[PDB]
Amino acid sequence: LAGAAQILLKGAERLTKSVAENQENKLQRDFNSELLRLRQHWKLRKVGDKILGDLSYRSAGSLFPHHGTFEVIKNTDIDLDKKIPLEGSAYIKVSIQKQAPDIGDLGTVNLFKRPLPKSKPGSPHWQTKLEAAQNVLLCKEIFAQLSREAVQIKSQIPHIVVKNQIISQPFPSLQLSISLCHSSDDKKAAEKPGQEDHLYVLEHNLHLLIREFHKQTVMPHPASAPFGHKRMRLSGPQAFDKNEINSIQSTEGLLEKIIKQAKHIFLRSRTAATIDSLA
Amino acid sequence: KRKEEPSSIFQRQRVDALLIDLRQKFPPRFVQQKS
């Protein structure tokens, strides 16, 4: 009886005393406290081996597939999560300069790749890495879409295009070639700053992609279930002209920006008029 | 601290096919002398 009592007491000490950490106060423990957090917050469960809900925009991407090698790990420390494992960072920047030939110099971001917010406010670092990966994949996708311009409608807008450089000349006043970098290849002057060509232009270009996704993703619901497009099905009730039939769809991508930025600098010309008044 | 992580590539894995092109141009010479 004494031996059985000692064995049961040892078992109870091993079970209910070394596992009562999170029962008294929520402390650092990946067990039943971290995995469900990120699960409920970001994705769902799936089992290839232990891969559950990789962030690849597969919901509306339709560009290229990518899996996620996400797995918990152990390490001796204090307040350490699972730290699940492109892997880099990207930056979108456009510059309307005068002109440029087919040359190479201290152009795109140097070793100081994409100076960005330190993000000192407390947030899950693994989640920051995850959203950064999502961002860089979005940059990859938008660049892959934008690259499809050489085989596009080559009329009224001639333009040269190479890897990472899409330098274009809509008017002989402005410049182009939005670029990107990979801030992962780094273990440890006065040309970078230019005219106003900053965040509040590129955001439109970025949003245009997800908007084109959305527009060609709304339930059909025309009457019961012919399963078609709203405007396409609603065309029948009215003898629309061939113009409207063509206007059912439209172009997208560079073309839009090809006008937009131009429009911008056009206003700039009018701006001169203002000060020209004083002159 | 890194003895099990084998970074697979399989994109340029074609290199292994090129691997069987050096011993054919010139093979290694056996020594049997572990000096």
Partner: peptide, 19 residues
């Protein structure tokens, strides 16, 4: 006397990327 054979299998780079 290190080896008396012809070896190419030891590399055996795995895939472990089943989708």
């Amino acid at each position: 006397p290190k080896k008396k054979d012809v070896e190419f299998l030891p590399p055996q780079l795995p895939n472990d990327k089943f989708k």
